[PDB]
Amino acid sequence: TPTIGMIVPPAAGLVPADGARLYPDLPFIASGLGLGSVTPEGYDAVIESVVDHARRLQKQGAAVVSLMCTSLSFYRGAAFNAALTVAMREATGLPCTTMSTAVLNGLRALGVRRVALATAYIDDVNERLAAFLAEESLVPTGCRSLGITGVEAMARVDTATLVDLCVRAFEAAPDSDGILLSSGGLLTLDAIPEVERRLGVPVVSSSPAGFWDAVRLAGGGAKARPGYGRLFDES
Numbered sequence: 057t058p059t060i061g062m063i064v065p066p067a068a069g070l071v072p073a074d075g076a077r078l079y080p081d082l083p084f085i086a087s088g089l090g091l092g093s094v095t096p097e098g099y100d101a102v103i104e105s106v107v108d109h110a111r112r113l114q115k116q117g118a119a120v121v122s123l124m125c126t127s128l129s130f131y132r133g134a135a136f137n138a139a140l141t142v143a144m145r146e147a148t149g150l151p152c153t154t155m156s157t158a159v160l161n162g163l164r165a166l167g168v169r170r171v172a173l174a175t176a177y178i179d180d181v182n183e184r185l186a187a188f189l190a191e192e193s194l195v196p197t198g199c200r201s202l203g204i205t206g207v208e209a210m211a212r213v214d215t216a217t218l219v220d221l222c223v224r225a226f227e228a229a230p231d232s233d234g235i236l237l238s239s240g241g242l243l244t245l246d247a248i249p250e251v252e253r254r255l256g257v258p259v260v261s262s263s264p265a266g267f268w269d270a271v272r273l274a275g276g277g278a279k280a281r282p283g284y285g286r287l288f289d290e291s
């Protein structure tokens with residue numbers, strides 16, 4: 057059984073909680089960066105260690121490595137997301153990916169070109185997300201955000217708040233194709249099917265998309281348990 061390796065923001069280096077729910081029969085291992093805040097200043101303090109964490113996961117027998125942070129991978133633009141991926145691959149000899157690549161792949165899989173943004177972030181990070189998506193030939197539309205920079209604070213946001221955030225972002229641009237719910241620090245699994253039910257458009261969420269994309273890269277065609285959104289169930 058291929059192990060999937062994940063580089064995660066918190067120092068503790070825990071497998072993000074969504075994995076046990078989405079893919080209960082797949083093994084995940086993780087290595088933690090110790091990110092201090094979800095801000096460019098925070099990213100700058102850990103970004104250089106990503107390659108070393110990739111190498112650790114390789115030594116542990118990982119079959120694929122994903123950098124499981126959207127903003128760490130998009131904050132410098134599309135070229136850096138690609139270059140960082142290549143650096144990880146050259147360091148490990150393994151298939152490597154990032155949570156930003158994951159959400160691009162998920163949005164494309166669901167036919168989303170015009171995308172409403174529902175995010176956890178402050179606006180410098182939101183602007184960088186919009187610029188990244190535009191570089192990648194997507195069209196960011198409405199935007200609502202929570203303005204959070206703490207890693208732990210993001211895990212505390214409840215399902216109903218996240219459903220409402222998505223609905224408000226979509227209602228700001230109701231001819232959008234879908235919604236990006238951005239930040240792998242959010243616990244979004246119960247929010248996704250509710251938003252999709254109510255609005256009739258797909259949602260791509262950072263953490264779940266990261267898992268979907270890593271499992272994709274592992275090349276076994278493993279399928280998630282049902283009810284976590286069209287991204288998973290449309291296979």
Ligand SMILES: O=C(O)Cc1ccccc1
Pocket residue numbers: 065066094124125126127128155207210238239240241242262
């Ligand atoms: O995805 C992000 O942009 C940030 C993030 C990822 C995982 C845990 C906390 C924050």
